[PDB]
Structure 1
Amino acid sequence: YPLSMKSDLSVSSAGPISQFNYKQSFSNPTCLILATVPHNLTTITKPLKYSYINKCSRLLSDDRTEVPQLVNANQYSPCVSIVPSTVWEDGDYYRKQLSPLEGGGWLVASGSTVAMTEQLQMGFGITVQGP
């Protein structure tokens, strides 16, 4: 997680990170740490680029109605099945036909990319219930 969209990574935020990427439980204490690995830890390998999902919605069987698919707390987004591990390019879009048993229609996902930094910046969402 690069620092440039810090405002999106907040508990009281309505950004795409909350909607379709990462939402936390409201009944348990949760800290968020935005950190960077400047030079020391070479064991951490930087990825190709930062990626996130800015749209995760389902098309109904009428091909006209779109229902957003919000990810629940401590769960994976339903759109990760078609979104690759790293989004290839900014504004990429993916479609998947839905079987009638699953509800019919289509599943549509949209991913965006953020360029790399010199030092890898990461985020920690840490949820809770000495010598």
Structure 2
Amino acid sequence: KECDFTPMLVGVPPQVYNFKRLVFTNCNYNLTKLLSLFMVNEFSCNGISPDAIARGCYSSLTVDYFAYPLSMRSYIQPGSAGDISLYNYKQSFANPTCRVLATAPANLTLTKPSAYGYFQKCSRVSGEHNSVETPLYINPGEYSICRSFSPYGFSEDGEVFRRQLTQYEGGGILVGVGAKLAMTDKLEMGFIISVQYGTDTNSVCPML
């Protein structure tokens, strides 16, 4: 069986705070075949070589993909501060991983969303007189608790979202502010490929 990457190439891609995550087990891949479908503008790896990533047998292969404008490529760099690293996406380095910033030409079948969008603020309100503001940052490779506020883009820049939280979700009032970025000429994407190894269960070998 072959690992198909269809949801990366069909439909409309999600925002950075709502990134889709594909996990592949017991299948075969052609990594270079997918990078050919895009005009890559950055392919930085950590823990694995940009060549060996396409030739290795893996226990599992996970890919986080999302729409991401090239103008904000510095906010996704390793060790970067800002809104992207705090309330949207932060790359995990627990496993060997590669970071891809690619532009999709019109040759592909995926459609451009209305605009780009990230979260400016995602904090919790609680305490006496609702006075305690605890900003809700994300661990690397996790979702913001503000993702359910707008799961298909922001209507306008500076959108304010508020909603009461359950006790499992911590409690208090969740406040979020969204930022809207204009859509570019072509579609610009962001791919985070990470690799997990096993003691003896590498069954995501490449295709030859």
With the length of structure 2 as denominator, give the TM-score of the two structures: 0.58
2:77 corresponds to? 10
The separation in 1 between residues aligned to 2:172 and 2:191, in whole angstroms, is 36
Matches within 5 A, 1:5-84: 5-41=72-108, 43-62=109-128, 63-84=130-151
SS of 2:146's partner is: helix
Q: CA RMSD in A?
A: 1.7
Q: Which runs of 5+ in 1 are unaligned?
A: none
Given that 2:76 and 2:90 are in contact with CA atoms closer than 8 Å, whether structure 1 keeps it comes out as no
Taking a change above 3 Å as real, the CA distance of residues 118 and 82 of structure 1, as seen in their structure-2 partners, is: same
The separation in 2 between residues aligned to 1:20 and 1:100, in whole angstroms, is 21
From 113, 118, 123, the counterpart of 2:190: 123
Equivalent residue letter for 1:58: R
Q: CA deviation at 1:15?
A: 1.8
Given that 1:98 and 1:105 are in contact with CA atoms closer than 8 Å, whether structure 2 keeps it comes out as yes
Q: Which moved more, 1:84-93 or 1:112-121?
A: 84-93
Correspondence 1:86 to 2:153: yes
Aligned length: 130
Given that 1:97 and 1:106 are in contact with CA atoms closer than 8 Å, whether structure 2 keeps it comes out as yes
Q: Which moved more, 1:48-57 or 1:69-78?
A: 69-78
Identity %: 52
The separation in 2 between residues aligned to 1:116 and 1:102, in whole angstroms, is 33
| Larger radius of gyration between Structure 1 and Structure 2 | 2
1:110 corresponds to? 177
Q: Which runs of 5+ in 2 are unaligned?
A: 1-67, 197-206
Q: Deviations over 1:49-82 (max 9, x none)?
A: 1111121110113211111111223221111122
